Amino acid sequence: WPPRSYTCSFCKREFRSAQALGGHMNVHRRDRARLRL
Ligand SMILES: [Zn+2]
């Protein structure tokens, strides 16, 4: 993802903070799982 806040490419959530971002992906965890990197 690009800098200047982060957005989830699944539910379109907003979070500049990595604390919210990292945890937010955990609540998804559906299919793909890294895919390649
Ligand atoms: Zn994400």
Swiss-Prot record:
- Which residues of the complete protein does this chain represent? 42 to 78 of 204
User: What does the entry say induces or represses the expression of this protein?
Assistant: Repressed by KRYPTONITE/SUVH4, member of the histone H3-K9 methyltransferase family that contributes with other factors to the CpNpG methylation of the SUP gene resulting in its silencing. The alternative epigenetic states of the SUPERMAN locus have been called Clark Kent alleles. Positively regulated at an early stage of development by LEAFY and by B class homeotic proteins APETALA3 and PISTILLATA. Later expression is maintained by both the B class homeotic proteins and the C class homeotic protein AGAMOUS. These two steps of regulation require the intervention of additional factors.
Specify the protein name.
Answer: Transcriptional regulator SUPERMAN
Summarizing the function annotation, the protein's role is:
Probable transcriptional regulator considered as cadastral protein that acts indirectly to prevent the B class homeotic proteins APETALA3 and perhaps PISTILLATA from acting in the gynoecial whorl. Principal function is to balance cell proliferation in the third and fourth whorls of developing flowers thereby maintaining the boundary between stamens and carpels. May fulfill this role by repressing genes implicated in cell division. Plays equally a role in the determinacy of the floral meristem. Is also required for normal ovule development.
* Distribution of this protein across tissues and organs: Expressed early in the third whorl, and later becomes localized at the boundary between the stamen and carpel whorls. Also detected in developing ovule primordia.
Question: Domain comment text?
Answer: Contains two overlapping leucine-zipper-like motifs at the C-terminal region, which might serve as a site for protein-protein interaction. In this domain, a slightly degenerated ERF-associated amphiphilic repression (EAR) motif seems to be involved in the activity of transcriptional repression.
Q: Where in the cell is it found?
A: Nucleus
Any extra remark in the record? Answer: Mutations in SUP cause the ectopic expression of APETALA3 leading to the development of extra stamens at the expense of the central carpels of the flower.
Map the zinc fingers (C2H2-type) to residue ranges: 6-28
